Amino acid sequence: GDVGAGEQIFNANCAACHAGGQNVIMPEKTLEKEALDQYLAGGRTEKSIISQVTGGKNAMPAFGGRLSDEEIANVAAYVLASAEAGW
Ligand code: HEC
Numbered sequence: 001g002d003v004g005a006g007e008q009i010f011n012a013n014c015a016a017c018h019a020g021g022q023n024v025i026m027p028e029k030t031l032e033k034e035a036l037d038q039y040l041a042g043g044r045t046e047k048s049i050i051s052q053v054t055g056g057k058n059a060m061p062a063f064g065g066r067l068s069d070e071e072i073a074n075v076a077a078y079v080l081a082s083a084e085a086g087w
Pocket residue numbers: 009010013014015016017018023025026028029030031035036038039040041049052053057058059060061063075076079
């Protein structure tokens with residue numbers, strides 16, 4: 001994916017709840033690689049991130065209306081790379 005576009009999408013749509021890769025609303029369920037391993041359905045993969053961004057889960061809204069599939073793929077790439085980089 002395009003992590004540059006991904007970062008822009010993240011700043012506009014995700015950073016309010018996930019700034020610094022954390023999780024405001026559900027504190028343990030962060031975007032850190034270890035938390036993705038534990039708490040994300042399907043584990044630490046771009047595919048699993050795309051699924052959750054697209055459909056939402058619990059307090060996390062769905063982005064399938066607001067974003068295109070390309071935008072979702074790009075933000076997923078950014079999240080995975082940032083997780084691997086420890087935010
Ligand atoms: C606040 C209203 C949120 C916004 C905006 C976004 N997310 Fe989120 N996210 C939020 C919650 C409450 C949770 C936990 C859901 C649950 O109950 O299991 C999440 C989870 C994620 C995850 C998985 C993290 C983990 O399990 O450790 C990912 C990968 C994720 N969220 C990504 C993400 C992106 C890329 C967003 C912008 C498009 C985004 N979220 C918005 C809360 C909120």
